[PDB]
Design a binder for this molecule. Structure first.
Ligand SMILES: *Cc1c(COP(=O)(O)O)cnc(C)c1O
Ligand SMILES: *Cc1c(COP(=O)(O)O)cnc(C)c1O
Ligand SMILES: NCCCC[C@@H](N)C(=O)O
Ligand SMILES: NCCCC[C@@H](N)C(=O)O
Lengths: 357, 357
């Protein structure tokens, strides 16, 4: 069969979750939306179940997936419900539910509920994605309280630029949040991975680490705490064909790359349909049999090419690391204006082989 | 549940397959590797089964998927086998098999085979991906013939730049192929979608249309025949939140976009984990309730934002077309240096709803 695969190190996952808790002194929801950012939500939840305060996902189906698999820890629906008809199963499966807008509030007020809802009331404190404006937040809170449909309320917001350590936007958003929620009782939840790792003045009773769990830094440069993260996914394959070429020969579609000299090229069983980025430029780092090398030629749907010229011992069957502990996925992604989040989420087709369960 | 979904129009698929056959007068393998470029290999094969000469996939597992579903038409493994241990099931499932390199040839020569193999001998005629060099092709052919392990041989190659209609690389590759295969008996197979649509002087007994099946042109400009293709996938969702903003307010992560004026923004239940590109720039075309609109703000993993200011009738629950028959997926992709192939292949999480079966 094809030698492509994605290794998922669950010990590394636990390590990274623990770092988040230790750094903050807060309860932490492991953010495992989008199939744990491509790593496998059920398997990652199972691995964290014994020690996690809870999980967070994008929608009720991701939530139900976890419940069907036997996850009993709290689960937060980060966007709430999309249809009011979801409410009976939200209550029955005991999902914690974000409320970010007026129509959701109204649906709760007129809904017939078997048990009260645990609501995470979301404020738009400056990212202008979802949530109530600061000036509308108090009234929303009082309406949840008055409804008799709501048990606890957690007050929440989310940062747009916490990955920019020299940008004060995070400070501004916190100030707006604190001013608009002042005097309201309940826990608060503000911090994502960059704020957990890099913004120690930001408060939170509940933190919400996503990308750090997977061992990719959200930051563009080294950081003493993010430096301690352990990459979870290794995307790897093998060389399936070798070719000797004279200089000036085009490699792959579009001839973006031509051989610079007489070279030996290896074809690898990996391509953009698997999630490896088509945008990866010539000179992109790869590891070949445990040594640094480069990608040359445009990535195809199923296949990619690497330079074997300075790797005389390498050839057919050599192992190639596309990303992992030697080839950081975030540095790769930022090369062409992406973030590690996207590449990890794009993982498809290849087997996922879990270790450390 | 979340309103995101991908519509797959199987009538459009059949239409596009038929165009390829009609334009060429050749037998056509429907290329449905990578889960039919994200559209669903089994469902697309089932839809084409009654009229298709055959299918082509990337590997034995994609082949087996089709056989398990009851597909009885020929199936070509475009990269052959990755391990010689695949040969017994290749023979038993009657897979046509590419042979592109010496180690595969050698494995066939020493393999014990229950039935002979139908081999597509692949030449590297200038793309320098897989296949035998022209000067090695004849000897490879004679070795297959002499082995007594091989029934038919189809002589094949593949073009690197046929999507560039003003580039003579396609002509050069054909010349090299014809010169090196001259006098050898058997059918030939050279044409992919751009060569089917745009290079009528190129011969082929078997054509291999992939991207045109899905109703996306491989070309950067209009073309009379590619213009007749019908988009197969519609990626759509709905507006899940609306927000009025003053001018100069940042929208989404990174604040790449700030409101230009007083605006109304809508949050859509679609993001890059679903396959919608994170690279999509502000001003990207979308269709909102059947009318042109634009994307503003950076796309998030699960959510994206659109400008509703000039859409006074639109709001909560409005339908948004991300790509499809009004919003061409190829034009979107080429905006930021991608191709339609990648975006379609990246489809994840959302339901696929087939019509026309
Ligand atoms: C995705 C998400 C997170 C996790 O974000 P990271 O930046 O990956 O840590 C936390 N909170 C919310 C509201 C999210 O949507
Ligand atoms: C993917 C593939 C095709 C189909 O290509 P399109 O450009 O999508 O038409 C045809 N032949 C080979 C060898 C392929 O790998
Ligand atoms: N068919 C065009 C799409 C990209 C590459 C593809 N030829 C592959 O088999 O990898
Ligand atoms: N969590 C960061 C990844 C991108 C966006 C994500 N916040 C969403 O819920 O869409």
């Amino acid at each position: 069969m094809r030698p492509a695969r994605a290794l998922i190190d669950l010990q590394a996952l636990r390590h990274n979750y623990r770092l988040a808790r230790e750094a903050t002194g807060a309860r932490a929801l492991a953010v495992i939306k989008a199939d744990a950012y491509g790593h496998g939500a059920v398997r990652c939840a199972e691995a964290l179940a014994a020690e996690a305060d809870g999980f967070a996902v994008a929608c009720i189906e991701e939530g139900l997936e976890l419940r069907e698999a036997g996850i009993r820890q709290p689960i937060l629906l980060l966007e709430g419900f999309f249809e009011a008809s979801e409410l009976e199963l939200i209550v029955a499966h005991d999902f914690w539910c974000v409320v970010h807008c007026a129509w959701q509030l109204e649906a709760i007020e007129r809904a017939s509920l078997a048990r009260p809802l645990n609501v995470w009331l979301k404020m738009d404190s400056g990212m202008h994605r979802v949530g109530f404006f600061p000036e509308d937040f108090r009234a929303a809170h009082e309406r949840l309280r008055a409804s008799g449909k709501v048990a606890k309320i957690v007050m929440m917001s989310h940062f747009s630029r916490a990955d920019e350590l020299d940008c004060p936007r995070t400070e501004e958003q916190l100030a707006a949040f604190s001013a608009a929620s002042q005097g309201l009782e309940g826990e608060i939840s503000l911090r994502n991975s960059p704020a957990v790792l890099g913004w120690p003045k930001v408060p939170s009773d509940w933190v919400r680490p996503g990308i750090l769990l997977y061992g990719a830094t959200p930051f563009e440069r080294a950081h003493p705490l993010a430096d301690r993260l352990r990459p979870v996914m290794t995307l790897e394959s093998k060389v399936i064909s070798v070719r000797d070429l004279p200089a000036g020969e085009p490699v792959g579609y579009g001839a973006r790359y031509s051989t610079e000299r007489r070279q030996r090229i290896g074809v690898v069983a990996m391509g953009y349909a698997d999630g490896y980025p088509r945008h990866a430029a010539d000179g992109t780092l790869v590891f070949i049999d445990g040594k640094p090398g480069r990608l040359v030629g445009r990535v195809s749907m199923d296949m990619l090419t690497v330079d074997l010229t300075d790797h005389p011992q390498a050839g057919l069957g050599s192992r190639v690391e596309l990303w992992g502990p030697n080839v950081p996925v975030g540095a790769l992604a930022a090369q062409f204006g992406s973030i590690p989040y996207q590449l990890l989420c794009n993982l498809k087709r290849v087997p996922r082989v879990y270790s450390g369960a």
